Amino acid sequence: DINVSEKIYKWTKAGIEQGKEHFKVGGNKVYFPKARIILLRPNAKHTPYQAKFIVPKSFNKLDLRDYLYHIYGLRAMNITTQLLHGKFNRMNLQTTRFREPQIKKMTIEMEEPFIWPEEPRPDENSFWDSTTPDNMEKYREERLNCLGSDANKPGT
Amino acid sequence: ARTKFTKPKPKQPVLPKDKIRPPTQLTHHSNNLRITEPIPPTTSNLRCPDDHPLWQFFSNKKFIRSADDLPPSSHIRPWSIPELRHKSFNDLHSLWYNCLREQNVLARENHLL
Amino acid sequence: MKVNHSISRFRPASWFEKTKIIPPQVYIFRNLEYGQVLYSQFPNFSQTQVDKLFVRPNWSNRKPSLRRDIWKCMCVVNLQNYKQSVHLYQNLCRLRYLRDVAQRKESDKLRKKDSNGHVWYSGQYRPTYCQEAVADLRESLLKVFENAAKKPSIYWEDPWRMGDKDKHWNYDVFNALGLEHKLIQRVGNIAREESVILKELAKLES
Amino acid sequence: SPGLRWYRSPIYPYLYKGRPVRALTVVRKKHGGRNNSGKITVRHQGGGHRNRTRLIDFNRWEGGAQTVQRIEYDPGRSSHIALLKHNTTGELSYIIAC
Amino acid sequence: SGSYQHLSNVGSRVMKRLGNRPKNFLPHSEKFIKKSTPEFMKSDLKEVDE
Amino acid sequence: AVPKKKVSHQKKRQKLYGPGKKQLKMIHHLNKCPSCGHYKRANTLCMYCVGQISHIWKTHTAKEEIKPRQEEELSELDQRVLYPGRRDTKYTKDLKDKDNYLERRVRTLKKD
Amino acid sequence: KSRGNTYQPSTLKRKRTFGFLARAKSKQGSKILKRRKLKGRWFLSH
Amino acid sequence: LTRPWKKYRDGELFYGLSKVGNKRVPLTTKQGNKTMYKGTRASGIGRHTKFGGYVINWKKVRTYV
RNA sequence: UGCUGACAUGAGUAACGAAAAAAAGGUAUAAACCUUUUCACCUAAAACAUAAGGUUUAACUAUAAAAGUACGGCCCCUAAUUAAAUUAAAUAUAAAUAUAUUUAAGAUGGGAUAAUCUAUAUUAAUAUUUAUCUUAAAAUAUAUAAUUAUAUUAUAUAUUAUAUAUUUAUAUAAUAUAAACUAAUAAAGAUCAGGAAAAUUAAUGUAUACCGUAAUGUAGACCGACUCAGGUAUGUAAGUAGAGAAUAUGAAGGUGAAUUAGAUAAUUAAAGGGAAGGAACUCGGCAAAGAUAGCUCAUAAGUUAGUCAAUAAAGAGUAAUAAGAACAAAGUUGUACAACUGUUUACU
RNA sequence: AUAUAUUUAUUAAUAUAUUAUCUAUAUUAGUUUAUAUUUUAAUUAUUAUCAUAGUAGAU
């Protein structure tokens, strides 16, 4: 009667009309999921109609969509998956090197737009204020990497 | 190789004026075209809904909960196992999903921090 | 065998009239990787189209990959006649050429620069190219209507992509025409069932 | 070339100038001197063209008279094969030719 | 930071080794920590184990 | 080709510091700049005064910065949406702190 | 003919020859692994 | 200069701190050949087709009820 | 020539690893970083795509988006091959183990459909190499029931007009460029005889998994202890020239570098030129020098008959007459020895 | 062709300044060239770089 992609589109439309899932629900029923997702800020390359998450490394695209539907009530129409590389890191050169974690980030497309709330001022929020920790780090760098007559050299 | 002795090649065989076909396309692009400055997309055209389900990942629509916005440690306690033991299955399930939601909100924030 | 498809050449109005695969319209495609835009007479495209547009590539404006996933439909613009659509398409190509080769310095001056004097980027995504394409589309359409029933329309991917309905898109000629700025229905996977959606749109205005 | 000077070979025009029947041929695995051990056991044996081995009947049990459809060249045997087709049975098989 | 370390448990053995430093090289470990910390942060009293 | 012995303290020092050729000389040829009453080299321009004049020229002969209209008239929210922030690399950060590795010119003493 | 570049990496080959599972599968490799464990080695194989 | 603050030849690398390091460390998805497929415990979902495709088996797909 | 550590001396010496720089401004801070402009070098590349490799080196943490058609992997299947696997008694064996057979693994290879987009699922039955010549045919001059003439010669496309169906459908004839190159085709030459392995309709499905995706890849991002003139797979690879990917240039692109500035003694390297000589050098013409088309003719002695000799040498015409790019092209003969084309001491 | 000026009446025109000499489509797959098509898409003075100082004659 009709092609496969068209049938799929029709099914999706029907599901939307229903207010049921816009996708075939699986049979492997997870009652108590332990997976968390980190809603990320949007990059320049994305639109207001997209949202990107850090998700579990063993999280499926379909699984993510299901999670978004049932936990939150949001319906992701299209989903992409970006498994990042794990660059080598080490505490110091005396320690063994190992990779940082491969981290899975899934973009979604959604039928209504969204823009984040504006990040707070330094005076307003206590935590979101990068001056202090950065200063502390700088001080640590100075003190450990200070050698001889740079002990007398005044602090930055 | 090219040399003192190399006579030049003949010109390519052109097809006569009468035999050549007229091209299928006659009228091309407008000569008047002008490079205008770009038109950057604006938020004014959007109508981001006040109850967009992605707000559920925030708490009171705050980019970050301040120390005052957070629940204090003395006021808050985790559930006791005995307390949980006399709760229904559906209730427990709901509690679990609320917990998970809270973690997600915190996880987003924690990551940012 | 048959080598050429509909996409394999530039198709004039007469060819379209003979065939009638799609209505009189032009398709526009964002590049999710780089932010570059790709115009086409058809809802599909090939390497030939890419070659035609991306003629003078550099580090800033690299010749894009033909991988199908990173290409996504920015805008589907419908017009009153096949000939008109062809003319619009030609105008867009001309504008692109001007921006890349002929009047490149002027275009560069017009763009947004970062510190260290480069055209603003995030990764290799540059958001100026899309903006230029919208501006270029607006220009080409305007020229077409100056040169010059169905009310023409521009089906957008996204309503946000308009600069502003007051500042731009409110010329007298457009108003006279009845240029309806509609958007494509997102009741399904927009990226995956894109071709189906485009077909449905085509069917709608015929 | 000073190397065609002493290349003398036999001409057999009646010989077949086509491929052998593919059902009667099996690939000729090359061991190249080495044995299971993996160590050159027969010295001086190396690598050449990708030859196929043609299953040439030596018992010639069958029985009855068969017509020689053609006489080909087997890369291995110095001899010549022959695509004997059973006059009645209707079947092709090879045999060292006389 | 620009870390991503906090979303995983990578290089676990190395972390354990660092975390569970031998107690007889505890002065060595803390000498540099003391140096790093400003005067208003640092405390005189010994940071006892859990 | 090769030293036969450990060269002594005496012999390395008389080699290095004994000859006047190898020593540093006093810069006797300083004199007053007429524009600002400070030390400068003889038969040389004052680096302060010429620098000041160069600065003046820059301030006057200044090619106007190109601010595109569309970016100048963006809303703040809209601008944030379009062009979000980013973490700079360690290298980038190092490059940014120019005062760490870039030497500004010192002023000379006032002549008497 | 300049020497020195005798190592010519190719992940697949390395994993075949010096990978953990190759060691495990052979008796000799299993013995090696055991020996490394006894020594105290953090990294038993590629 | 690779970096303008370092005019002279310190023993600093073109990138990173040390070239050398422990080579014996488990592979990731990014490493290896074109044929090297690690995977991330994400998709024991359906079944691989004879032709190279894939067919989802929905009774073996995770829902979050 | 004890070991570990510290620090001396040589010594502020040699060196800063093929190189094109300038300016102006970022920025009254810049030989060294960014921007603009000029100049230059690479261009069958120092370019654009990639493979492999790797301290992510990236246009970076707000990060490298794939149902499939010029996407790969995964997956299906195998090659070479591998395997505490396999088969009262599989065979053999100080033990280890080995062998043979099965069985499971093994890509560098095979693998369905598709822009007028495409549907893989479950079930029922039942191809070594190599060539594209000839000839013939169709065609424009001749001349106009000729001979010459030289080109055309299998494929792919739009158009027009029909023709058949009723404005699609398809057939039909009609016009329509040189050179490459490509894919499906056909027919065809030799000896060196040219891989493996994985049904059909019909019915019923198909709410599209995972994984690679940056940049780097003739290199500062792999191998070479170094940001190492070494090593490192593939397709592209402006035009104009030409036989050509040779050689010149080089549109575009991408560079101009972890040393500069002066100076240019003796002296060394790398070049250019050189009067009268003309191998007098010297172990020895080592090195350097030497090319009177590269095309078309024409080409001896000898001889195993193979223009082997031979790209012969000389000579000739096309070009050139004072000369006025690069690049290919470097004489002849006797003797010893080895027939030849090859191989060998990776580093004398 | 844009921007001044301006004969003049927006616009012709007058003047200089700048800017430009492309581009698009045939011709049966691709590429390049050739010609028609498209278009405003120009035909002499004098330079420059490269080609080993490009080569050569002098100096």
CSV table of N, CA and C in Angstrom, one decimal, chain G residues 12-36:
chain,number,residue,atom,x,y,z
G,12,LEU,N,45.8,-4.0,16.0
G,12,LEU,CA,45.3,-5.4,15.8
G,12,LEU,C,46.3,-6.4,16.0
G,13,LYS,N,47.5,-6.3,15.4
G,13,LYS,CA,48.6,-7.2,15.5
G,13,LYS,C,49.1,-7.3,16.9
G,14,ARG,N,49.3,-6.2,17.6
G,14,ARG,CA,49.7,-6.1,19.0
G,14,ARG,C,48.7,-6.9,19.9
G,15,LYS,N,47.4,-6.7,19.7
G,15,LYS,CA,46.4,-7.4,20.5
G,15,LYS,C,46.4,-8.9,20.2
G,16,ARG,N,46.6,-9.3,19.0
G,16,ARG,CA,46.7,-10.7,18.6
G,16,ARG,C,47.9,-11.4,19.3
G,17,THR,N,49.1,-10.7,19.3
G,17,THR,CA,50.3,-11.3,19.8
G,17,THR,C,50.5,-11.1,21.3
G,18,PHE,N,50.3,-9.9,21.8
G,18,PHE,CA,50.6,-9.5,23.2
G,18,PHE,C,49.4,-9.1,24.0
G,19,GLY,N,48.2,-9.3,23.5
G,19,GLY,CA,47.0,-9.0,24.2
G,19,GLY,C,46.7,-10.1,25.3
G,20,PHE,N,45.9,-9.6,26.3
G,20,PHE,CA,45.6,-10.5,27.5
G,20,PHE,C,45.0,-11.8,27.1
G,21,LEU,N,44.0,-11.8,26.2
G,21,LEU,CA,43.3,-13.0,25.8
G,21,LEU,C,44.2,-14.0,25.1
G,22,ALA,N,45.1,-13.6,24.3
G,22,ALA,CA,46.1,-14.4,23.7
G,22,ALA,C,47.0,-15.1,24.7
G,23,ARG,N,47.4,-14.4,25.7
G,23,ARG,CA,48.1,-15.0,26.8
G,23,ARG,C,47.3,-16.0,27.6
G,24,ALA,N,46.1,-15.6,27.9
G,24,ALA,CA,45.1,-16.5,28.6
G,24,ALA,C,44.9,-17.9,27.8
G,25,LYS,N,44.8,-17.8,26.5
G,25,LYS,CA,44.4,-18.9,25.6
G,25,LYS,C,45.5,-20.0,25.6
G,26,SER,N,46.8,-19.5,25.4
G,26,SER,CA,47.9,-20.4,25.4
G,26,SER,C,48.2,-20.8,26.9
G,27,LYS,N,48.8,-22.0,27.0
G,27,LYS,CA,49.3,-22.5,28.3
G,27,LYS,C,50.5,-21.6,28.8
G,28,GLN,N,51.4,-21.4,27.8
G,28,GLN,CA,52.6,-20.6,28.1
G,28,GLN,C,52.3,-19.2,28.5
G,29,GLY,N,51.3,-18.6,27.8
G,29,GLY,CA,50.8,-17.2,28.1
G,29,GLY,C,50.1,-17.1,29.4
G,30,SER,N,49.4,-18.2,29.8
G,30,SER,CA,48.7,-18.3,31.1
G,30,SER,C,49.8,-18.3,32.2
G,31,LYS,N,50.9,-19.1,32.0
G,31,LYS,CA,52.0,-19.2,32.9
G,31,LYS,C,52.7,-17.8,33.1
G,32,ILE,N,52.9,-17.1,32.0
G,32,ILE,CA,53.4,-15.7,32.0
G,32,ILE,C,52.6,-14.8,32.9
G,33,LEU,N,51.3,-14.8,32.6
G,33,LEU,CA,50.3,-14.0,33.3
G,33,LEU,C,50.4,-14.3,34.8
G,34,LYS,N,50.4,-15.5,35.2
G,34,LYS,CA,50.5,-16.0,36.6
G,34,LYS,C,51.8,-15.4,37.2
G,35,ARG,N,52.9,-15.5,36.5
G,35,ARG,CA,54.2,-15.0,36.9
G,35,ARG,C,54.2,-13.5,37.2
G,36,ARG,N,53.6,-12.8,36.3
G,36,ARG,CA,53.4,-11.3,36.4
G,36,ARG,C,52.5,-11.0,37.6
